[model samples]
Target: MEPLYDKNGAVLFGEPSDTHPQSTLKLPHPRGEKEVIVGIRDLPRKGDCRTGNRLGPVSGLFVKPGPVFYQDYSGPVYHRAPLEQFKQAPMCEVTKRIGRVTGSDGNLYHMYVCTDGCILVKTAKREGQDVLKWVYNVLDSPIWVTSC
Candidate 1:
């Protein structure tokens, strides 16, 4: 995927602490803008803690800043991908641990998979179950990814 290229684009990984640093953002529109002291929102958009390395789990996926949070790295690095159910092979044997996701608040909410990979499905927030399900349906259908 494109994120793969970004990882390869620059030496974006190394030194754990400095290499994969935690980043914060300033939200333009807030649910309670005047209520919170969020001149710039604080986001845990960093790695090196959960996965125990620079390129922890998400180190291999696309990432980007999100509203109320950040998700998917909208860089030249990320690209489209696909997922499909495998037959015969055991779930463990057929599937592999691709990545993991936990929001800025530190919750290992989800894991990622990579098989017959493409980039149709962008990363989701812990609250993105509906979005994830829709994407899964589309990708699971018999269709090819294209710039439509």
Candidate 2:
């Protein structure tokens, strides 16, 4: 759930990217001196090669540079909201797609009933076994997703 909000939430650290587009940072005190290249890192996405639209997947972590990599022109936009409030909020039924992932034991299998923020997963181990399904409050386990 928090992962979904990562792209929309307010900045917790560092200055907003405005005047300086290619700014770098060096940590001080507690973490000690460590240099960090602070800037927007855009990773291009292949959205319909026929139109040749090179849209890419971006992260909010790389925020600071204004205009960002992408923005909200659709759906209800939120600047800030409590985690509990979000928990009680209804899940967004965006899409359901097939995916695969490895478990704690490094066993890989099909993942099903996935949404933009959640999914139900299992490995082909035990026959007709009750594979755990996490609808919400699934902090430890990560949901699976794919391009198509």
Candidate 3:
């Protein structure tokens, strides 16, 4: 596929105030080599048909690890669909963390998760359990930052 910038209107400058990621970025691109914010959904799935594959590696897959903005997963977050066996067993996969995503207005959208996406108490309040919440709880206190 194209290197994103290869497409028209791909390079966005600064940050936008809107919640959408496409709207962010200022008129000019970053001065140095910018990092690409790869969402979990954007990564290549292992084809395991399991939900755990959705969570992209924060430092490697998500961000290139350099000067960058921020990012967050605005999509569905669950706690059970991925399954514990398919999750990061090494990390325990149970801790809340913040997701940093830059908005269009150069602002940040810090999404606070309920521990690896686990909605334990919050889940009870929601009446029944949701698949998204199950997947969220398996995050293992990881935050996705948009590096520049």
Candidate 4:
């Protein structure tokens, strides 16, 4: 894929914004609404499915689950289906192609956006360097568009 360049001819890295789509899930509250924001633990364990914790009250919005591969910081990429373990796990709608970056292994990586609002990047594993993984390292900063 061709890299996105700024007007100055520098590579551009896409950043997330509040204007992007927000993720929501079903809630069982006594109130009228049944949809609430989805939240994941800050520190995820290996092999842990990227599912929302049942203990905490739904807080801030999260990237909607999508039909892509997702993994913990050090686990194998797992298929993110619409429903996992009989729970509602909606797939995200890929809205845009952010950009591409060359990984440390010299492999090209691509970034994308979900309609539910999150930045997705293609990644690789340390052990099996050839295998690709997907991660959502949500950011709140501006895109780096210069050759630094």
- What's model 1's TM-score? 0.20
Q: List the residue pairs that clash in candidate 2.
A: 17-64, 45-55, 45-56
The local lDDT score (0 to 100) that residue 89 gets in candidate 3 is 24
Q: Please list the residue runs of candidate 3 whose C-alpha ends up more than 4 Å from where it truly belongs after superposition.
A: 1-9, 12-94, 115-144
lDDT of 4 by residue, 1-148 (tens): 2222232223344331111111111121111012232223342222222343443322222222242221111111111111111121234566655344333333343445656655444432234323232333232112220011
The order of the candidates by TM-score, greatest first, is 2, 4, 3, 1
Q: Which stretches of candidate 2 lie over 4 Å from their true place?
A: 1-55, 58-95, 114-118, 125-130, 135-148
> What is candidate 3's CA lDDT for residue 37?
45
Worst 10 residues of 1 by lDDT: 30-39
Candidate 3 lDDT, 1-148, residue by residue in tens:
0011211223223222222243212223222122334433354233312222333222221222121122323222111112231222223243433234432223343322333443211111224332222233233222223221
Worst 10 residues of 4 by lDDT: 75-84
For each candidate, the alpha-carbon lDDT, in order, equals: 0.22, 0.26, 0.26, 0.28
Candidate 1 yields a Cα-based lDDT of 0.22
**lDDT of model 4, residue 104:** 31
lDDT of 4: 0.28
The digit string of per-residue lDDT tens for model 2 on 4-113 reads 21222333343222111111111110110111222223322334212322232221111111212221111111121112221222333433323444333334434444
lDDT of 2 at 123: 48
Q: TM-scores of all models?
A: 0.20, 0.28, 0.21, 0.25
- Local error of candidate 2 at 25, Å? 32
Candidate 1's residue-wise lDDT over 51-139, tens digit each?
32322222222222111112223232212222222112212221222233322223222222224332112234445431121133222
